[PDB]
Amino acid sequence: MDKIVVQGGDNRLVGSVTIEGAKNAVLPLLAATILASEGKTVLQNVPILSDVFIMNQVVGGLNAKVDFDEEAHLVKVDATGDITEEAPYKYVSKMRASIVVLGPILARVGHAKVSMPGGCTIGSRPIDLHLKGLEAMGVKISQTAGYIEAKAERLHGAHIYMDFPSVGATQNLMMAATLADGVTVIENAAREPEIVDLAILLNEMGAKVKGAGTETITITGVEKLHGTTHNVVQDRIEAGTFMVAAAMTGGDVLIRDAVWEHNRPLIAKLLEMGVEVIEEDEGIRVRSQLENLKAVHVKTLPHPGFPTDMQAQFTALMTVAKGESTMVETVFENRFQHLEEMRRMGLHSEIIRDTARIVGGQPLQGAEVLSTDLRASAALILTGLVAQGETVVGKLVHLDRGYYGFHEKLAQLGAKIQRIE
Amino acid sequence: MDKIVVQGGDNRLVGSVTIEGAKNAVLPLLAATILASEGKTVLQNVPILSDVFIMNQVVGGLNAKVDFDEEAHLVKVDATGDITEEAPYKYVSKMRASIVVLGPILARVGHAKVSMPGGCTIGSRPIDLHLKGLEAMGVKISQTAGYIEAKAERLHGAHIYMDFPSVGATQNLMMAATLADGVTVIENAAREPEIVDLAILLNEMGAKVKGAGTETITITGVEKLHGTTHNVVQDRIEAGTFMVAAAMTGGDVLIRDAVWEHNRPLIAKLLEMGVEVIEEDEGIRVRSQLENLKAVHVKTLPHPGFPTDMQAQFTALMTVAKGESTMVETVFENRFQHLEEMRRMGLHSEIIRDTARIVGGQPLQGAEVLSTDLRASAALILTGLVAQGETVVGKLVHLDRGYYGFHEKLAQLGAKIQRIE
Numbered sequence: 001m002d003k004i005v006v007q008g009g010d011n012r013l014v015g016s017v018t019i020e021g022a023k024n025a026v027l028p029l030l031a032a033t034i035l036a037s038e039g040k041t042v043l044q045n046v047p048i049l050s051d052v053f054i055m056n057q058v059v060g061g062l063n064a065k066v067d068f069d070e071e072a073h074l075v076k077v078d079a080t081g082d083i084t085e086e087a088p089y090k091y092v093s094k095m096r097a098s099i100v101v102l103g104p105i106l107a108r109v110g111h112a113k114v115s116m117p118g119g120c121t122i123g124s125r126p127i128d129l130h131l132k133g134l135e136a137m138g139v140k141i142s143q144t145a146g147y148i149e150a151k152a153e154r155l156h157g158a159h160i161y162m163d164f165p166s167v168g169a170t171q172n173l174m175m176a177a178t179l180a181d182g183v184t185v186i187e188n189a190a191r192e193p194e195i196v197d198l199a200i201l202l203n204e205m206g207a208k209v210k211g212a213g214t215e216t217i218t219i220t221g222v223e224k225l226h227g228t229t230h231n232v233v234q235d236r237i238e239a240g241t242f243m244v245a246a247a248m249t250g251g252d253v254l255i256r257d258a259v260w261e262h263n264r265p266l267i268a269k270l271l272e273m274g275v276e277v278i279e280e281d282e283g284i285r286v287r288s289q290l291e292n293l294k295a296v297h298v299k300t301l302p303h304p305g306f307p308t309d310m311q312a313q314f315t316a317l318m319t320v321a322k323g324e325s326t327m328v329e330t331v332f333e334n335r336f337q338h339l340e341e342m343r344r345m346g347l348h349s350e351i352i353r354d355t356a357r358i359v360g361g362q363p364l365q366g367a368e369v370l371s372t373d374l375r376a377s378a379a380l381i382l383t384g385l386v387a388q389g390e391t392v393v394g395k396l397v398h399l400d401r402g403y404y405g406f407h408e409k410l411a412q413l414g415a416k417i418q419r420i421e
Numbered sequence: 422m423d424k425i426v427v428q429g430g431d432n433r434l435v436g437s438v439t440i441e442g443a444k445n446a447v448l449p450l451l452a453a454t455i456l457a458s459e460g461k462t463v464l465q466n467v468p469i470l471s472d473v474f475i476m477n478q479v480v481g482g483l484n485a486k487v488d489f490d491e492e493a494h495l496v497k498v499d500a501t502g503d504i505t506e507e508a509p510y511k512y513v514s515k516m517r518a519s520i521v522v523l524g525p526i527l528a529r530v531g532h533a534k535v536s537m538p539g540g541c542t543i544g545s546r547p548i549d550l551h552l553k554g555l556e557a558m559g560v561k562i563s564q565t566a567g568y569i570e571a572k573a574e575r576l577h578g579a580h581i582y583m584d585f586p587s588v589g590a591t592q593n594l595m596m597a598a599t600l601a602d603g604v605t606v607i608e609n610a611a612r613e614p615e616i617v618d619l620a621i622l623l624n625e626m627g628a629k630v631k632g633a634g635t636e637t638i639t640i641t642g643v644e645k646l647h648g649t650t651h652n653v654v655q656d657r658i659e660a661g662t663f664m665v666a667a668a669m670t671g672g673d674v675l676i677r678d679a680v681w682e683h684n685r686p687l688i689a690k691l692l693e694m695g696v697e698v699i700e701e702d703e704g705i706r707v708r709s710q711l712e713n714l715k716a717v718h719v720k721t722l723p724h725p726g727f728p729t730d731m732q733a734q735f736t737a738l739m740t741v742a743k744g745e746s747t748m749v750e751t752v753f754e755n756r757f758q759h760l761e762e763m764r765r766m767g768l769h770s771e772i773i774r775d776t777a778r779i780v781g782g783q784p785l786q787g788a789e790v791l792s793t794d795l796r797a798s799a800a801l802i803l804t805g806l807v808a809q810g811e812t813v814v815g816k817l818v819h820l821d822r823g824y825y826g827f828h829e830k831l832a833q834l835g836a837k838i839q840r841i842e
């Protein structure tokens with residue numbers, strides 16, 4: 001379909017950029033609207049992304065009324081009617097994150113039918129942590145012709161120790177627990193900012209959720225939740241993507257209203273590399289002198305460690321620094337596909353299992369490249385800014401799941417970039 | 422788009438099956454036709470596959486005349502004219518194996534322009550072994566706007582120790598060596614049957630290639646090669662796929678004219694599992710009693726070890742054996758994607774890095790599933806034969822690269838299977 005075309009070199013980025021609401025918070029926040037049996041829920045700062053339109057179809061398919069005012073970045077949900085139980089294959093097959101309606105359907109309805117997710121290109125993503133935790137809460141799981149068929153005669157709390165701090169499983173279990181009998185304790189919980197924002201929404205709806213952001217979340221079940229109005233937290237991955245873009249072009253960019261505390265492990269590694277990062281009244285400013293950039297080691301880890309969703313973009317910055325950088329991806333088994341396409345731009349990298357070694361300063365050239373996944377697409381476009389000549393990036397269906405107007409925002413900062421239909 | 426629909430649970434396969442010429446031999450054999458400056462080359466037993474049509478476009482684009490008589494399974498090549506140098510992005514981006522014209526173009530023309538391959542879904546596949554070996558032969562490598570630019574002022578032999586026995590790099594280097602000055606020795610060479618068949622063709626064309634099938638290939642360069650007529654070796658992966666299908670359905674199938682020596686590590690593991698494998702005058706017969714199948718351990722390795730191109734299909738057979746089987750995939754890093762789609766059919770598997778553990782005897786159900794790659798597609802269809810209910814397999818573009826008439830061959834053995842347009 002469309003292509004993004006970048007004229008390489010001389011793309012120093014200068015100016016200010018507005019960041020959308022978080023893709024990875026709005027999807028579970030929309031799932032949470034099913035819990036409210038009284039009042040309507042309004043989410044503000046909603047990003048206009050393909051994944052949001054799909055989740056609105058999933059929630060609407062449960063007999064909730066979903067209205068998306070795109071100009072106002074607002075979604076209104078009326079879940080006060082009789083909620084139904086099915087999340088069909090036609091939606092789950094297009095977006096794995098659809099799975100986070102399982103918990104709220106079980107809490108509100110007591111039974112659910114959710115298509116089992118299949119393979120994902122960036123790694124094996126089994127949902128046993130979701131299903132094991134729900135079984136501990138009294139849910140009987142069957143699987144029939146591709147569907148998870150879940151029944152809770154009397155959903156109840158459980159003391160769950162997570163083998164891994166799964167973001168999606170933590171969200172599913174927290175939401176199921178809000179209307180379960182008694183207390184649920186999730187040990188080794190995901191600590192990501194999106195977990196915190198979901199807990200804020202649930203507490204605004206009349207739930208009793210404590211500890212979000214720590215390794216232990218405690219939920220005290222209640223009889224019913226109420227709708228509320230809530231601003232989606234800023235997208236820290238879109239914010240971090242523009243911080244990386246500023247750093248690798250020797251730019252000076254103000255990322256408007258960026259949250260320092262969400263951006264911590266990225267900001268610390270940018271400061272270690274020699275990038276300047278300044279907290280100002282209107283946002284976080286990122287500036288760099290290209291000759292000051294030094295190679296670093298990064299290891300992706302569950303929050304508060306370095307976020308896997310920033311890894312591909314950070315490897316693009318490692319290409320311009322001085323020395324050999326090392327990126328260790330521990331969260332996803334197969335998230336270095338962008339480094340394979342970057343070979344076409346002249347980038348040599350050494351990949352052994354979960355570790356990529358990248359010598360900075362190689363003389364890259366623009367080439368025709370194809371996106372394999374959302375963050376890989378952004379990493380290819382960022383590398384196109386610094387390569388010599390013209391880069392053409394295709395398979396933009398991936399970029400459109402998580403960035404709104406990426407080429408327009410880069411062009412207003414001074415990049416020679418166009419999106420051609 | 423097209424779908425394969427399987428009615429499962431009762432699909433004992435009985436009868437005889439014809440196997441096509443090898444997709445992994447015909448592609449390098451077609452590249453080798455560029456070496457012949459006198460006489461035309463005729464390949465017989467050519468399979469009707471999408472990859473063959475692309476390779477015919479690559480070779481035709483070098484100013485060789487390529488005629489494919491599909492009814493006769495015959496390709497005729499006239500490379501006696503002035504051969505050109507470019508293998509463009511529009512072909513390499515659709516088929517990585519296009520890269521094996523680099524060696525023969527350098528041998529025949531002395532310069533080449535070949536699009537650099539990018540990412541592949543089943544694993545990182547860098548071509549450094551190809552380029553390092555060509556540099557040792559006097560080729561100067563540049564990279565410009567996505568293309569490998571290669572020039573050999575006077576191509577010559579080299580004593581190359583391969584870091585890994587790469588099939589494609591071994592093919593590229595042995596073809597380049599045929600017209601180089603002096604002797605080339607490839608240590609730690611690929612030993613696969615497709616290497617042996619390519620060496621047979623080169624020797625029939627007047628080359629001096631010795632040692633194919635062993636860890637050391639020696640090539641003595643000559644001035645020019647001549648066209649010849651050659652039967653493509655039988656596809657041992659299609660043959661092995663029907664051996665696995667017979668075993669997992671408790672069938673009795675004669676795989677016509679199968680070559681025992683090419684099928685060795687697969688046959689030995691089938692015998693260890695309890696399958697009966699009988700060498701007969703018309704082919705290799707595979708029979709099994711389902712209650713006799715026992716779990717086994719398999720590790721993929723370079724030939725003569727167990728072939729990675731049989732791994733996915735063999736994991737489908739592991740689902741019906743008694744006990745816990747283990748599959749270690751050492752050749753590719755991302756080749757367990759079919760096991761994630763198989764969770765939709767009810768299959769639980771434990772995947773840690775390169776190792777998959779599969780408990781046999783789980784009660785699988787048919788579901789709608791999507792192919793991720795060629796051998797994964799075959800593995801999903803085979804699992805559909807034994808699951809209870811209807812399996813629908815999509816994304817058949819992958820299957821069509823390596824199997825001709827797969828659903829028709831299974832239906833004539835008794836499978837309840839249809840390909841719907």
Ligand SMILES: *[C@](C)(OP(=O)(O)O)C(=O)O
Binds near residue numbers: 097122373
């Ligand atoms: C991965 C990216 O999951 P999703 O697309 O989000 O369902 C995939 O399917 O490749």
Ligand SMILES: *[C@](C)(OP(=O)(O)O)C(=O)O
Binds near residue numbers: 514515517518542543
């Ligand atoms: C792998 C399968 O290589 P190819 O398709 O053969 O070029 C890929 O590109 O996914």
Ligand SMILES: [Cl-]
Binds near residue numbers: 089788
């Ligand atoms: Cl389904």
Ligand SMILES: [Cl-]
Binds near residue numbers: 620621624
């Ligand atoms: Cl021979």
